[PDB]
């Protein structure tokens, strides 16, 4: 009758602990096979049916979201880690989730949570220190250009794929995308677009806004492609002579007022084309098409237009040029209207695309995809994001590490060897430690069709023998040098996922127990 | 949020699960593969009943929630813009990869590693169909062959009747808004329209733009020599609105007045024809029986009742500009076009207008005509067929020879490639080159052989008997060799069918789990 929980559902100690564990690696599995540039995809369909495949370990943690109160922990560091970075969230849930495997069965041996938070404390802080001594400084070494150990940099994610051919012009552009920007650089800034057909080497790159332009309508041989200071319009507005947007309906019973019907109906629409010419804007363009009759009109008084544009790219136009969208006409004015240097309109892909080039805001860019399907520009474009934040990540940070888990072996066997030279409770835990750092060289190993048993043995007896750069390749199964291959990774990212991970795995170990207020 | 019933499955049982609901699609349409396959019933959501073998109508009408499933529906409407002959083979094909496949799974080897044996043994087929390969209109241009090669395709549809006549309208067009040096088709200028009635030999081909309308007056004249258009959305007549009337007389003094604007604008709108120079009138609406009077004499062509949409087609071709209101009326405005006749189909009168350039220009419409709805519906999809292979016969003088001789000459090739290739992909050029024999081997199916018994014989033929390739005779004609037969199909048509076929095979096996939320 009289109770303490009535409804309330609590439970302490090791089950609480036990059950937390097992809770995290549901959320590191569903990542797990997602982790390097070859892992698979995965297929999450929303509640109203639509699909999403994408290999990313941080937009498919965003549309999971799990109810579970210890699984929202990780989730949580992960959303932290991408909005500071944006790469890293796979291998944070990797190692946190390993973090509490290796020490699961040391829990149900009787051995108290508060040791084993000592020992990812200490254990980690040796970590940091041990990287910034063997990281290594590499800007005008070998006396290269940046230029040149960026391009093989670039060619590297690009390695072994379809453009692995033609692999050598792309290089470039990625090189080209990345150098055109200021001394600011973010992954949305440059934009990029698929058109099918033609030869992959066809694929150029714009420094300006570019747009499919599916404008077919009225004023061919007209509105000049060549202008200097051109007043730059973003309207929403919809200029067609019949659409839902601008029209007239009236019915009566005398004759003559259709003749005032039919030219106050014009009219209404002039009031709205007379506003754009008052306003001097130059080029004019839309979302909405704009019939012909207002083409008309505006090749008789000297103004371009170029309608059907994305509101996307309008957005990306709209931060280029500097100006506004505006969705009236009776608000256009100076303020909302941008500039550009050089507007010129090109052949490229045998349809007309419209590109502003030499606008002073204009810190975006944009590269069109040429390939025979979709299929070559899709698995093509999702190396092109990874491709430019290696560019990205290597004029920002000097001292960099070698990736493929091969920072991940040199810390598995400083920590071992230190683990035995101290007395205590704390030779288990920090052995631990060392053994779960072996998840990130592993998963490589077996999303990549691999045997990892053969590579990690033949990997960790090379460590022995001192060599500290070697790592796992990707393409080739064997063991090789990932510094003289140039894959490199910034020094101190590697070390914010180590304090992530560790950080997360602590928080677990401390609560014994989950109180739920019933409601 | 919604955890709970959400679809959880990985390993190697999602990905069987997979191609058991990819299999389900390709065993449906493995039959159909072929002038002999059987047609396929379809039920309307409105209760019609068609019945047609045609691929692209199949994966059309099929509604499955399966995702795997959707993605090969994907895949056909790509094709339709490209191929349009072997979407079925297509789907066979993929069909054939993922079988395969399935036996694969069973010995360990990696999905990913599987994709790879199939995009490097696709690449060893793809240059062999360019050494077997022969053209036909090199360094020449001739309308003969390509009238005989097109009318072989089209003789196992609905319009086998009329198909010599089918096969002589698709050349003129595409010559039209192409010419054969450039060897650049827009399909899209390329246009398709159909009315009930009369037989497929009715078909006729007009370079311009056309809508079935006719003439205000009957005893217009049938053909106008000068070219002046005019495009409005107003009759010439008293002021009418351009959507509906509703005619409600109020007084006598108002009915007595409408008269007074009856004889003063029935000639006012009529002498502002000659004082601008117009000949054809364009208008919206119709010309009651006074207004075609005064245009009798002067010969004053005119199209009565104008649809809506058609307006703007007119304008786009003839080059044209619409004019709204009466105070816009200018000689700038006014459309150009060669001649402007009025045919009419047999005693029946549909009396169309037509608009011809006199000439070559870039906008042409094929207006079929047939008995039935469903025998025209089927000889829309069947003419689109030979849009699109004159497109690649065009773009591409190279050919190969149909009737499975391509798909079982690639076989030997890829096979001798396997032990070249001395790692785990070399089982995957294997089975890559078991499943390309699917689609010769289905072919016989449908026409009432042993497929085992043939498909041996033909490759034996291909190696012992001649080192040329050899096709398979479905038609049960006189004997083997379809190139005494006159089966060709396109090169590009052969690269992008085992090309898109592959890429949605390996875009499959990377995909090993779905989650989907559940109802709570």
């Keep these: 009758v009289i109770l303490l929980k009535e409804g309330t559902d609590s439970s302490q100690g090791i089950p609480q602990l036990v059950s937390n564990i097992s809770a995290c690696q549901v959320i590191a599995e569903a990542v797990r096979t997602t982790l390097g540039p070859r892992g698979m995809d995965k297929l999450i369909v929303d509640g109203r049916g639509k699909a999403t495949i994408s290999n990313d370990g941080a937009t498919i943690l965003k549309l999971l979201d799990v109810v579970h109160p210890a699984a929202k922990t990780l989730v949580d560091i992960a959303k932290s880690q991408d909005a500071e970075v944006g790469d890293g969230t796979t291998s944070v849930t990797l190692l946190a989730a390993e973090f509490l495997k290796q020490v699961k069965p040391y829990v149900e041996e009787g051995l108290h949570p508060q040791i084993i938070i000592r020992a990812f404390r200490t254990a980690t802080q040796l970590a940091v220190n041990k990287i910034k001594e063997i990281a290594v400084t590499v800007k005008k070494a070998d006396k290269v250009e940046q230029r040149k150990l960026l391009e093989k940099c670039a060619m590297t994610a690009l390695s072994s794929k379809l453009i692995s051919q033609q692999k050598a012009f792309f290089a470039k552009m990625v090189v080209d995308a990345v150098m055109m920007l200021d001394d600011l650089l973010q992954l949305k800034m440059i934009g990029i677009k698929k058109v099918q057909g033609g030869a992959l080497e066809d694929s150029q790159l714009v420094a300006g806004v570019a747009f499919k332009k599916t404008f077919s309508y009225a004023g061919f041989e007209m509105q000049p492609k060549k202008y200097h200071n051109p007043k730059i319009a973003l309207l929403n507005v919809e200029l067609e002579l019949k659409a839902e947007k601008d029209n007239a309906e009236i019915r009566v019973h005398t004759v003559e007022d259709y003749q005032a019907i039919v030219d106050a109906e014009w009219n209404i629409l002039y009031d709205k084309l007379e506003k754009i010419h008052h306003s001097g804007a130059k080029v004019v363009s839309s979302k909405l098409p704009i019939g012909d009759v207002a083409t008309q009109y505006f090749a008789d008084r000297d103004m371009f237009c170029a309608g059907r544009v994305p509101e996307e790219d309008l957005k990306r136009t709209m931060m280029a040029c500097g100006g506004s969208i505006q969705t009236s006409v009776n608000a256009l004015s100076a303020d909302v209207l941008g500039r550009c240097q050089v507007f010129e309109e090109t052949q490229i892909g045998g349809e007309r695309y419209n590109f502003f080039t030499g606008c002073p805001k204009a810190k975006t860019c944009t590269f069109i995809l040429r390939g025979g399907a979709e299929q070559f520009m899709e698995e093509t474009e999702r190396s092109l994001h990874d491709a430019i934040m290696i560019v990205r990540r290597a004029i920002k940070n000097d001292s960099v590490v070698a990736g493929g888990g091969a920072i991940e072996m040199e810390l598995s066997k400083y920590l071992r060897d230190y683990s035995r030279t101290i007395p205590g409770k704390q030779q288990l835990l920090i052995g631990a430690y060392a053994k779960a750092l072996e998840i990130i060289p592993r998963q490589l190993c077996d999303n990549a069709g691999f045997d990892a048993t053969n590579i990690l043995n033949k990997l960790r007896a090379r460590h022995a023998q001192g060599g500290t750069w070697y790592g796992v390749d990707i393409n080739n199964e064997d063991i090789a040098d990932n510094f003289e291959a140039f894959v490199w990774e910034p020094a101190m990212v590697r070390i914010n996922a180590l304090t992530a991970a560790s950080e997360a795995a602590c928080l677990i170990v401390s609560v014994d127990e989950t109180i739920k207020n019933p409601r | ?520």
């Design chain 2, 1 to 520: 949020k919604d955890q709970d019933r959400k679809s959880r499955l990985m390993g190697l049982e999602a990905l069987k699960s997979h191609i058991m609901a990819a299999k389900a699609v390709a065993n449906t349409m493995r039959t159909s593969l072929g002038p002999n396959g059987l047609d396929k019933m379809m039920v309307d959501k409105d209760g019609d009943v068609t019945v047609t073998n045609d691929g692209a109508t199949i994966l059309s009408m099929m509604d499955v929630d399966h995702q795997i499933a959707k993605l090969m529906v994907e895949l056909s409407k790509s094709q339709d813009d490209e191929i349009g002959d072997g979407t079925t083979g297509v789907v066979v094909l993929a069909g054939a990869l993922l079988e395969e496949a399935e036996q694969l799974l069973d010995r360990g080897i990696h999905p990913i590693r599987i994709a790879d044996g199939y995009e490097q043994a696709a690449r060893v087929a793809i240059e062999h169909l360019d050494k077997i390969s022969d053209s036909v209109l090199v360094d020449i241009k001739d309308t003969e062959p390509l009238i005989q090669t097109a009318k072989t395709t089209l003789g196992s549809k609905v319009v086998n009747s009329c198909h010599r006549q089918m096969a002589e309208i698709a050349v003129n067009a595409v010559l039209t808004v192409a010419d054969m040096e450039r060897r650049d088709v827009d399909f899209e200028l390329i246009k398709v329209e159909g009315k009930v009635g009369g037989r497929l030999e009715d078909t006729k081909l007009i370079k311009g733009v056309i809508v079935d309308k006719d003439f205000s007056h009957p005893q217009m004249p049938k053909k106008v020599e000068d070219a002046k258009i005019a495009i409005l959305t107003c009759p010439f007549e008293p002021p009418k609105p351009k959507t509906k009337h509703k005619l409600d007389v109020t007084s006598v003094e108002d009915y007595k007045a409408l008269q007074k604007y009856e004889k003063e604008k029935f000639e006012e709108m009529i002498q502002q024809i000659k004082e601008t120079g117009a000949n054809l009138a364009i208008c919206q609406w119709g010309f009651d029986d006074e207004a075609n009077h005064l245009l009798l004499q002067n010969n004053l062509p005119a199209v009565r009742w104008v649809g809506g949409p058609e307006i703007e087609l007119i304008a786009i071709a003839t080059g044209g500009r619409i004019v709204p209101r009466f105070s816009e009326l200018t000689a700038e405005k006014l459309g150009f076009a060669g001649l402007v006749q009025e045919i009419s189909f047999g005693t029946t009168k549909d009396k169309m207008l037509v608009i011809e350039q006199c000439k070559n220009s870039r906008a042409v419409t094929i207006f079929i005509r047939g008995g039935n709805k469903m025998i025209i519906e089927e000889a829309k999809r069947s003419l689109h067929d030979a849009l699109c292979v004159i497109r690649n016969l065009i773009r591409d003088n190279r050919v190969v020879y149909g009737g499975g001789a391509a798909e079982i000459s690639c076989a030997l090739a890829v096979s001798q490639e396997a032990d070249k290739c001395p790692t785990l992909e070399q089982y995957a050029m294997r089975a890559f080159a078991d499943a390309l024999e699917v689609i010769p081997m289905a072919l016989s199916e449908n026409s009432g052989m042993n497929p085992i018994q043939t498909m041996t014989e033909v490759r034996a033929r291909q190696v012992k008997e001649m080192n040329p390739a050899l096709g398979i005779d479905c038609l049960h004609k006189g004997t083997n060799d379809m190139k005494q037969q006159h089966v060709i199909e396109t090169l590009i048509g052969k690269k992008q069918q085992i090309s898109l076929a592959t890429q949605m095979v390996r875009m499959i096996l990377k995909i090993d789990d779905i989650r989907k939320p559940g109802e709570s």
